[PDB]
Design a protein around this nucleic acid. Structure first.
Ligand SMILES: NCCC[C@H](N)CC(=O)NCCC[C@H](N)CC(=O)NCCC[C@H](N)CC(=O)N[C@@H]1[C@H](O)[C@@H](OC(N)=O)[C@@H](CO)O[C@H]1NC1=N[C@@H]2C(=O)NC[C@@H](O)[C@H]2N1
Lengths: 100, 82, 136, 126, 100, 215
RNA sequence: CUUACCUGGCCUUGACAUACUAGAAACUUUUCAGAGAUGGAUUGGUGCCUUCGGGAACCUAGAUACAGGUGCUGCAUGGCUGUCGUCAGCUCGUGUCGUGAGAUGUUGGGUUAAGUCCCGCAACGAGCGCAACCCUUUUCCUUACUUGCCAGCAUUUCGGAUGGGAACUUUAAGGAUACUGCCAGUGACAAACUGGAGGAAGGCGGGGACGACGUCAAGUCAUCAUGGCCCUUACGGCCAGGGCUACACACGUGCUACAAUGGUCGGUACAAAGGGUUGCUACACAGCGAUGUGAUGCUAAUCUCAAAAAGCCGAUCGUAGUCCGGAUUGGAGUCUGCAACUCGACUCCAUGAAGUCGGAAUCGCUAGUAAUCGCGGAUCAGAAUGCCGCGGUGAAUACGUUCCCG
């Protein structure tokens, strides 16, 4: 991937982490049933007024080594090319060629 | 469609503009990129220039279009035949 | 094959009459692995022929199969014993398919009775193969 | 009194043979109650019918895994093994009938690049 | 009514067996009753990794990773039992969880 | 055709993993990424220390890195200051206290990575590739291997058309899973681009299997 | 978002690195304008070491070497991959023959899935290939007895529920067994080959992984690395909206059907494998339903996804474009998400298209296979008829090598 795309991803994670608490608070206030309808409406308005990059749905998993956005394999944190290389070198504990 | 328990969605910047115009009575078009905003009853009688990707198409809001998204009146693809 | 001779696959006798002929007929009737439906179809015919005219269910089926059995291929060649039964079963299934009744079992029994008396698309087809054999 | 274990297509049956009038229970159920189709009922009764001792013994059978056919085969295998345990002299007859052999056939795994164990995607040279 | 429950998790069944044998031997030496080790079902995870860098969908490596689990029960634990178990070394690649 | 990785195919048969730790799915990824960073950092730092194998373990809330080297003195330092600096750097990278251990290789010519590094250094210093290959093969066979194969690929000597040259002495039974085959790959960066070096060394058949290896 | 493309709005040593010069802790609150990128007012905090004259991060300002480039060359390359092809071949040393390139060995007779093995011979000797070693399945034994099991005993709300038991199933580590071992006939008096007993299994029991020397300037500069070329207020970087989803058409790979071996309704059985703490959810209430609320157990052989479906029993439909089929369209909703217009999935009511088994031609499959039925997972907020796996039911036919192909 390009350095610009990697830095974009990093900035998005930073924004999500910065706004994590207030987003959860507003969502809880929205879900509150004892709260007033005006209170829940205001909470919804503030949630919609939060910056876009605060939303976790805009994060994309990228390979931890190269930044590739396809074939991620959450468990290892690496895309398929680097995963194949590392597994066949033997630096991934417990992973072996599978046959049955 | 959006859940009824959440209400219709309108962008705040667009809603403030239409509210200011209606509190006043300015007739100049309101220029917006918010194709996703829902047309509200307050919108009726106003001209909104909705972005369609390259231009801003003017739409005059009539009563029959309340409940539509603004983008349904600004097509984004060009086609005339083969 | 090419170099080997494959041993014939022996099928078990049916668990009710211990008759490999009836088991093979059930296999010919059965579609996409539904053995129980084919069992119902065949056993309905076997029970219904017994009620309509009293003979042994196995013996009556064997006699009709022998009647529908051809003896010539196609350059003339005689059919080996296995293909006689193999071709009679297919003819009896295909022809019994097209007669109109409520259930498949009743159609099968009806054409079993019909072929026992010399009328049936099966033995028309047998006589057609006979004609073609006389042609050469 | 005597015990046998039968296996067929991931189905395992535990068979407890005794001396009795002919009672037969599968998973606290009658044979007719447990098996719907006739052939499954007949496969279970094959060994005692062959030995002509259908009324000589009492059976307590449990079974787990597989389907109806696999469970019937496992029950037959377990009954054969229990009879072998009861008397070693019956082994030639049961082996001649073919009840002693464990059917080792099993589902073949799906393979990479194929739709099934053997079935291949359609090919177009044109 | 004190019972010690030890759970061993590993990616290598030989390592987990060695650790379980060591624990059982130490507990037996300290004069305590031991039940086990009991082999719990193994977890198997499979992955399909494309081997070519660009386009060969039928060219993949199939990898697997296994999680082995063992359970050890100590009943009637003597005084020296707990101290000996804590003094026992922790081998890399085996996770040991102790519950009282 | 293409050949399977000789180490990867034996990773559970006669070969041990280079990482030995357990982690649940929540920290597996973080542990692996930090391990890879450690390997890269060590490979860069000890370039001239003749280092082939790095083994990473996480025994209990800590880390242990075993470095196999043919230059223990240069790795250790004059008075041991260098291993203390390495411990500081590795602790900083890994987030947990780390202990460095040194494994001295007494037979460098039977180690696949060291031979590949030597050949690549010769190629970068512009020694003729065939001479370098035959010298390496003869040195290993004198050291005592039962077989060695060396392969070089690229613009050999500066030619515009790239090609591949290999040379083998002894026995290299690649299809026997129980054979002890060390394998290594290395890059030589020349004015005309990249030349790849591959080395296989065979050191006899291992009997008893993984039980003998004590996995 | 991804995103690399388009329209428009913005930045210029830059979103990111090293080298230099100065000043500030870093950070934090409230807003205002703007589509946002951005820009401006406005709070608190001003911290950590200290040989303490300053330093550690961290931020801002200046400067120039530079950064940056999914821009070009896979016909400069590394690495990786496809293909012939799981084809049985491919080589080397000493000695002989030839002026020589070369030959011999490796050919010749049987046998095998195999250059697999046995015989002859100016040849005598070796390697990589084949096979085996590795994984899984079928029989048995030992160890292990919980969260799994329940044969015998006892109590039971008849629920392994409870005392209890270690038998059996299973779980999973280690072993045993199969070797033409025994008999008969042949082969050539060899390698081999055919039949029989015992045995769970008999001659390679089944499946997986493993792919020789080489070929196609095959594929990939857009995973990554890298020689060379090109851009540098732009071919770099930031943003909002649009596009990748277009539609007179043609082709490939699939799913669903055209029905009675079936459709619908009522009742009632039997799996395997895998997933679950930002998660899976018992149970209750509300709703026709997608779902909502309350609540419970579970970091899991413990709780849960979960209903297996085809199957069996009973009723009905009676060959009709139908009680087949389920496209399309109208009207209402739910959930994920800042946001379902372009352009999501699912639910309810209404609608009810083509389709009556498909030309020339052509594809897959030799057994638990084909056919058919359901279940799970990776990616993933949401979004599979694809891909990778799992079990259930369970066939037909192989006379033979005359021609089709390799
Ligand atoms: N788009 C643009 C791509 C441009 C391309 N990259 C140029 C390229 O690579 N040129 C090569 C190169 O100069 C060199 O090759 C290596 N390896 O350096 C040379 C050695 O022969 O061959 C040339 N290629 C050739 N092709 C030709 C062929 O077949 N006949 C006739 C003659 O024109 C031959 N020369």
């Amino acid at each position: 991937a390009k350095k610009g795309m990697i830095n974009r991803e990093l900035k998005r994670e930073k924004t999500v982490a910065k706004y994590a608490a207030k987003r959860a608070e507003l969502k809880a206030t929205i879900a509150n049933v004892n709260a007033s309808d005006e209170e829940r409406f205001e909470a919804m308005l503030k949630l919609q007024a939060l910056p876009r990059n605060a939303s976790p749905v805009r994060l994309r998993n990228r390979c931890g080594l190269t930044g590739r956005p396809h074939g991620y394999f959450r468990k290892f944190g690496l895309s398929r090319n680097k995963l194949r290389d590392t597994v066949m070198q033997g630096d991934v504990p417990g992973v072996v060629k599978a046959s049955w | 469609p959006r859940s009824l328990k959440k209400g219709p969605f309108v962008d705040a910047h667009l809603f403030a503009k239409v509210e200011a115009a209606v509190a006043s009575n300015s007739r100049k078009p309101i220029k917006t990129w918010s194709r996703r905003s829902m047309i509200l009853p307050d919108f009726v009688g106003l001209t909104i220039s909705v972005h369609n990707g390259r231009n801003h198409v003017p739409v005059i809001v009539t009563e029959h279009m309340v409940g539509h998204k603004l983008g349904e009146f600004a097509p984004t693809r060009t086609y005339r035949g083969h | 094959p090419r170099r080997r001779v494959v041993a014939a696959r022996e099928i078990l006798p049916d668990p009710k009459f211990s008759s490999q002929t009836i088991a093979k007929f059930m296999n010919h009737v059965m579609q996409d692995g539904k053995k129980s439906i084919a069992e119902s179809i065949v056993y309905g015919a076997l029970e219904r022929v017994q009620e309509k005219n009293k003979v042994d269910p196995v013996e009556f089926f064997e006699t009709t199969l022998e009647k529908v059995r051809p003896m010539v291929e196609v350059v003339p060649m005689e059919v080996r014993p296995s293909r006689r039964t193999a071709l009679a079963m297919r003819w009896l299934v295909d022809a019994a398919a097209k007669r109109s009744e409520k259930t498949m079992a009743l159609r099968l029994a009806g054409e079993l009775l019909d072929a026992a008396e010399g009328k049936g698309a099966a033995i028309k087809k047998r006589e057609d193969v006979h004609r073609m054999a006389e042609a050469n | 009194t005597n015990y046998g274990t039968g296996r067929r297509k991931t189905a395992t049956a535990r068979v407890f043979l005794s001396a009795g009038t002919g009672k037969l229970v599968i998973n606290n159920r009658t044979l007719e109650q447990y098996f719907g189709r006739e052939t499954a009922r007949m496969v279970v009764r094959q060994p005692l019918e062959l030995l002509e001792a259908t009324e000589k013994y009492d059976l307590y059978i449990t079974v787990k895994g597989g389907g109806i056919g696999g469970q019937a085969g496992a029950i037959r295998h377990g009954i054969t093994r229990a009879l072998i345990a009861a008397d070693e002299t019956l082994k030639p007859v049961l082996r001649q009938a073919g009840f002693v052999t464990r059917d080792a056939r099993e589902v073949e795994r799906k393979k990479l690049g194929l739709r099934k164990a053997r079935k291949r995607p359609q090919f177009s040279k044109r | 009514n004190q019972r010690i429950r030890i759970r061993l998790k590993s990616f290598d069944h030989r390592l987990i067996d060695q650790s379980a044998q060591e624990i059982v031997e130490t507990a037996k030496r300290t004069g305590a009753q031991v039940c086990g080790p009991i082999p719990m079902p193994t977890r198997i995870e499979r992955f399909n990794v494309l081997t070519s860098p660009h386009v060969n969908k039928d060219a993949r490596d199939q990898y697997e990773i296994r999680t082995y689990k063992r359970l050890i029960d100590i009943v009637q634990p003597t005084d020296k039992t707990v101290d000996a178990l804590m003094k026992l070394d922790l081998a890399a690649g085996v996770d040991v969880q102790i519950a009282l | 055709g293409q050949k399977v990785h000789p180490i990867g195919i034996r990773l559970g048969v006669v070969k041990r993993h280079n990482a030995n730790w357990y982690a649940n799915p929540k920290q597996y990824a973080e542990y692996l990424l930090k391990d890879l960073q450690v390997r890269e950092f060590l490979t860069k730092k000890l370039k001239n220390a003749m280092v082939s194998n790095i083994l990473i373990e996480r025994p209990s809330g800590a880390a242990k890195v075993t470095i196999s080297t043919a230059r223990p003195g240069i790795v250790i330092g004059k008075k041991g200051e260098d291993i203390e600096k390495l411990q500081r750097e590795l602790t900083n990278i890994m987030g947990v206290p780390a202990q460095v251990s040194i494994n001295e290789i007494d037979r460098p010519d039977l180690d696949a990575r060291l031979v590949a590094e030597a050949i690549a250094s010769q190629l970068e210093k512009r020694v003729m590739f065939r001479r370098a290959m035959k010298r390496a093969v003869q040195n290993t066979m004198r050291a005592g291997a039962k077989g060695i194969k060396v392969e070089v690929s690229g613009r050999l000597g500066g030619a515009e058309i790239a090609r591949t040259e290999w040379y083998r002495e002894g026995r290299v039974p690649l299809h026997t899973l129980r054979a002890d085959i060390d394998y290594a790959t290395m890059r030589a960066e020349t004015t005309y681009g990249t030349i790849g070096v591959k080395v296989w060394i065979f050191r006899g058949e291992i009997l008893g299997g993984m039980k003998q290896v004590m996995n």
